[PDB]
Amino acid sequence: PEARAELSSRLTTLRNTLAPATNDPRYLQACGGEKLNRFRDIQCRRQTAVRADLNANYIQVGNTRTIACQYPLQSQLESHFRMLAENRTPVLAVLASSSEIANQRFGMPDYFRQSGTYGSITVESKMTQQVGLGDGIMADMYTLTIREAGQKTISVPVVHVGNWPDQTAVSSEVTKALASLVDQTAETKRNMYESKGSSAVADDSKLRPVIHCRAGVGRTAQLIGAMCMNDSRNSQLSVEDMVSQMRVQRNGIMVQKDEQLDVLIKLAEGQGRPLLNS
Amino acid sequence: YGPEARAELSSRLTTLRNTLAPATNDPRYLQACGGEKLNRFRDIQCRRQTAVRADLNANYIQVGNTRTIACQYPLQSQLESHFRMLAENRTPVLAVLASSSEIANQRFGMPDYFRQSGTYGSITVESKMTQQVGLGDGIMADMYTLTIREAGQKTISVPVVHVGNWPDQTAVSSEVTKALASLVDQTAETKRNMYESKGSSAVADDSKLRPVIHCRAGVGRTAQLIGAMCMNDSRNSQLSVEDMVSQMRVQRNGIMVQKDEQLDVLIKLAEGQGRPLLNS
């Protein structure tokens, strides 16, 4: 009760500090009258921005490097597939469910289960299997081939959690299962780039897991937090440090709901990881 | 816990299971009287000593402080006796752990007795669904009030917690199981206190006001929920996981905790409490 409440106070204060002012120099602004942020108040830390036209950030919490982003707006699809291609994406985790995707009010393009042409990019996907994660939650696996004029064809593994519960929170147990599936798909594809001699492997802003739910601050932060607690080398980090690093690297809302922070506390607890600093 | 301790736990439990295996017309197990099918599955029998009625495959279980009734899903021909058990028991909560998909598969012969209104010999029942409660990971408990009316007898209302979308394929995590054990306890606690303010004589009877729990055979998911309910009680602290599964098996049959995945939920919950797995 006590330490959790204190953890919330420090994170609320940080959040308030990070709040976006009008045309805030810390946050990426829409250059050119195109809509950049899907939600007016979930903005992109400029400094860690991957591209000027996407609301997406490079995050690194300890040893864990990922890209967290919002679900791309229809107009952002070509830049979004360019980000996935240049990054040589070892795994793309989509945490928005099929019910969310299919509800047109939300305007979330089904870009990875269909084949399409986006400016100069042609993509096609193939479903290869479903993997159970626990409690009936299933990850549907797809191969996304991105082809571009004059450029190489890049294949991106997609882990889609098709039936992520729209109502309840996902347990820490299913979250750890999903973090582990995401690391193993990433490890495998990374070793394929390595055996083919891609320069990609030497460049630390490449081969990063790309993770997004709808806005890229709730579920996204739950999974990234779990992937960090999973890598041994992150031993020294408290929950206070991890959420803090995510917030100053994307925006103040990373780990948006209490239900998401409780999953991070449960996992921490199971490791003897500290919640707070001191 | 350690792979080693878990493996030893499985050895002790397998030996007990083999000690308890039913011989032909075994005196420890309830035998079908006449040409009436008693057992929904012929290998999953009913311990005679703790049996509730001679015509049901259902047992009184008491692990430490926790008293429940575990039964198989009643066969069509057992529905009147089943409703009599639920009424005489003054059942505070009936937890049904078989999903809607299982119930609707006619090959399985599982009568949908709690979501419909019907007449079974002299008993008339009716249900009303009152609300769904979310347990975690998209699993939902659908709540129903079952009213059992019988000629010359009182009308009794049984709260039903139905886990409508219990996953048919995977195991249910310890987190959702803990959420389900707690809903069941709270529903029971409430109906128990209504009988108490009304002055029910039943609250002093230790064979009454027991949670009735059943899945399909009443040995797998049933054993998972009952183990969790025992661990939610402070007076059961001294008991290892070996003692709880061993008592359940001697009180019903030795298939209680039917799968390894069921045992692993019990080990995860145990671990989170610093409860021991083994005895010594």
Domains and CATH numbers, chain B: 1-280 (3.90.190.10)
Tokens (6 digits) for B140:
């939902």
Show contacts of B1-8: CB within 8 Å, 24+ apart. Answer: B1/B267, B1/B270, B1/B271, B1/B277, B5/B277, B5/B278, B6/B267, B6/B277, B8/B278
Q: Are B45 and B29 in contact (CB under 8 A)?
A: yes
Bridge partners (DSSP) listed for residue A141:
A129, A159
Sole residue written with tokens 């259902």:
B58
Phi, psi of B90 (to 5 degrees): 50, 50
Helices (H), B99-220: 100-103, 174-197
Phi, psi of B63 (to 5 degrees): -115, 110
In this structure, are strands A154-160 and B123-136 parallel, antiparallel, or unpaired? unpaired
Pairwise CA distance, residues A6 & A275, whole Å: 10
In this structure, are strands B58-63 and B212-214 parallel, antiparallel, or unpaired? unpaired
Its sign, for the CA torsion B228, B233, B234, B236, is: negative
Pairwise CA distance, residues A62 & A236, whole Å: 9
Phi, psi of B165 (to 5 degrees): -120, 40
Q: CB count, 10 Å around CB of A238? A: 16
Tokens (6 digits) for A139:
């990850």
Nearest residue of A to residue B173, measured between CA atoms: A135
Pairwise CA distance, residues B231 & B64, whole Å: 10
Rg of the Cα trace of chain A? 18
Q: Which of A165, A167, A173 sits opposite B173 (nearest CB)?
A: A173
A14 CB contacts (<8 Å, ≥6 apart)? A244, A247, A248, A252
Q: CB count, 10 Å around CB of A90? A: 24
Q: Are B44 and B253 in contact (CB under 8 A)?
A: yes
CA angle in degrees (0–180, nearest 5) for A107-A108-A111 = 135
The closest alpha carbon to A214, from A4, A18, A39, belongs to A39
How does DSSP classify residue B256?
S
Pairwise CA distance, residues A69 & A18, whole Å: 18
Please count the CA atoms within 13 angstroms of the CA of A128 that sit on its side-chain side: 11
Rg of the Cα trace of chain B? 18
Q: Are B125 and B83 in contact (CB under 8 A)?
A: yes
Sole residue written with tokens 């992937």:
A227
> 3-state DSSP call for residue A139?
strand
Its sign, for the CA torsion A128, A133, A135, A139, is: negative
> 3-state DSSP call for residue B67?
strand
Q: Which of B138, B167, B170 sits opposite A165 (nearest CB)?
A: B138
Pairwise CA distance, residues A222 & B217, whole Å: 38
Pairwise CA distance, residues B41 & B19, whole Å: 20
To the nearest whole Å, the CA of B166 is away from the closest chain A CA by 8
Helices (H), A87-202: 98-102, 172-195
Angle between helices B241-251 and B3-19 (to 10 degrees): 20
Burial of A124 (0-12, 13-18, 19+ CB in 10 A): middle
End-to-end CA distance of chain B: 16
Sole residue written with tokens 């939920």:
B265
Sole residue written with tokens 């998909």:
B101
Q: Are B68 and B213 in contact (CB under 8 A)?
A: yes
Q: Are B279 and B243 in contact (CB under 8 A)?
A: yes
How does DSSP classify residue B249?
H
Burial of B33 (0-12, 13-18, 19+ CB in 10 A): exposed
Judged by CB atoms closer than 8 Å, whether chains meet at B173 and A170 is answered as no
How does DSSP classify residue B178?
H
Pairwise CA distance, residues B196 & A210, whole Å: 58
In this structure, are strands B118-120 and B123-136 parallel, antiparallel, or unpaired? antiparallel
Pairwise CA distance, residues A80 & A97, whole Å: 19
The closest alpha carbon to A163, from A138, A189, A182, A185, belongs to A138
Between the CA atoms of B169, B171, B175 and B176, what dihedral angle is there, to the nearest 10 degrees?
Answer: 50
Pairwise CA distance, residues B118 & B25, whole Å: 35
CB contacts, 8 Å: B101 with chain A: none
Q: What is the layout of strands, in order, in the sheet containing B212-214?
A: B58-63, B66-71, B212-214, B94-96, B156-163, B139-150, B123-136, B118-120
Tokens (6 digits) for B235:
């007076």
Chosen for mutation from A163, A171, A172 (greatest number of chain B CBs closer than 10 Å) is A171
Its sign, for the CA torsion B86, B87, B88, B90, is: positive
Angle between helices A219-230 and A239-249 (to 10 degrees): 130
Phi, psi of B262 (to 5 degrees): -75, -40
CB contacts, 8 Å: B135 with chain A: 168
Residues in chain A: 278
CB contacts, 8 Å: B271 with chain A: none
Tokens (6 digits) for B39:
């057992």
Amino acid type, B22: P
> Catalytic site residues of A?
213
Helices (H), chain A: 2-18, 77-86, 98-102, 172-195, 219-230, 239-249, 258-269
In this structure, are strands B58-63 and A92-94 parallel, antiparallel, or unpaired? unpaired
> Catalytic site residues of B?
215
B69 CB contacts (<8 Å, ≥6 apart)? B52, B58, B59, B60, B61, B85, B89, B210, B211, B212, B213
Method: X-ray
